[PDB]
Design a protein around this ligand. Structure first.
Ligand code: NI
Length: 341
């Protein structure tokens, strides 16, 4: 059944709750972003109102074929009324079109649901600065102190310099980047840009990117593989077998592959620095795992929460085990005692 952490008290609203059939009492289904664990269950057959960002609305229409009459896109940073309740969508700094949702309850309670986010100090100067938030439904993906990772900017710098050096040394080297969802487009666009190439991809992936309101996107991507030297492939295909295979497909236009697998966290983060990353190599194939995250580090999450000072925290990630729940609750208490709320 729909878990309690997907329901917004005192409303008929749910958040990211499309896989339980009809939720008894739900008058409006919010969708924070277009990632499959969150939209799971939507299709052209859905007949309830869906409230989301414009970009999430483009993907619902074009990729899932949800009918236009049930998609209700809202602008960001704008006070809007939904079934008698004031809401605001804020940028979540996750994947394109991802939002956090502020709910102003008729009784005076204010609730923030983060969806998936990567906390940033810039959020301390949004509409959130303007009033008190009583309850926080928090993306707790990396809520443990071992989870450190570099800034997105540092990681992109590393990938750009790596690619540029490799291809300038060998102009017959191919660059490949893995993907399985929207998010992390900066990785392959920044690389293609330093190389003066467009990025080449399947028709399905190109369609997906064309939904995202990226400026000058027609100048940066293409479905013609042969004219591009940065290829996107399914993350599954980023391994020696899948890459050798792929190299045969290019017909002797290339004799070397340099591949990037933009992972979440991986345990080499607890030892090694970004300047010190190395690839796995077999022959003329090298694979780099780079820690490009679209979720808060532990420290970034801690800062955000200690700034917001919520009265109650409801985790939405890692809630399935008593040991994770108990550990998260201990961090929340430490934070509260250190900061004095
Ligand atoms: Ni997500």
């Amino acid at each position: 059944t729909c878990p309690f952490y997907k329901k917004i008290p005192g409303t008929g609203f749910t958040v990211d709750a499309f896989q339980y059939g009809v939720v008894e009492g739900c008058t409006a289904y919010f969708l924070t972003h277009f990632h499959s664990d969150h939209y799971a269950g939507l299709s052209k057959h859905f007949t309830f109102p869906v409230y989301c960002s414009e970009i999430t609305g483009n993907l619902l229409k074009n990729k899932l074929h949800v009918q236009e009459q049930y998609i209700h896109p809202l602008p960001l940073d704008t006070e809007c009324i939904v079934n008698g309740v004031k809401v605001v969508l804020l940028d979540a700094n996750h994947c394109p079109g991802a939002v956090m949702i502020l709910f102003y309850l008729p009784n005076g309670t204010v609730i923030l649901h983060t969806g998936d986010f990567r906390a940033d100090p810039s959020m301390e100067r949004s509409l959130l600065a303007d009033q008190k938030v009583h309850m926080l439904y928090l993306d707790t993906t990396y809520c443990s102190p071992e989870y450190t990772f570099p800034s997105q900017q540092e990681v992109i710098r590393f990938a750009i310099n790596t690619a540029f050096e490799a291809v300038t040394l060998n102009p017959h080297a191919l660059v490949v980047c893995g993907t399985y969802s929207i998010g992390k487009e900066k990785v392959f666009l920044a690389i293609a840009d330093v190389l003066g190439s467009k990025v080449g991809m399947s028709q399905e992936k190109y369609k997906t990117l064309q939904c995202l309101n990226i400026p000058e996107i027609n100048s940066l991507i293409t479905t013609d593989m042969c004219s591009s030297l940065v290829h996107l492939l399914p993350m599954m295909q980023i391994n020696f077998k899948g890459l050798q295979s792929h190299l045969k497909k290019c017909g002797g236009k290339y004799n070397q592959i340099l591949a990037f697998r933009p992972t979440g966290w991986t345990h080499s983060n607890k030892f090694t620095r970004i300047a010190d990353v190395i690839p796995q190599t077999k022959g003329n194939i090298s694979i780099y795992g780079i820690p490009y995250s679209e979720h808060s580090s532990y420290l970034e999450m801690k800062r955000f929460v200690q700034w917001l000072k919520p009265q109650k925290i409801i985790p939405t990630v890692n809630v399935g085990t008593w040991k994770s729940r108990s550990t998260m609750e201990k961090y929340f208490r430490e934070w509260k005692l250190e900061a004095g709320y």
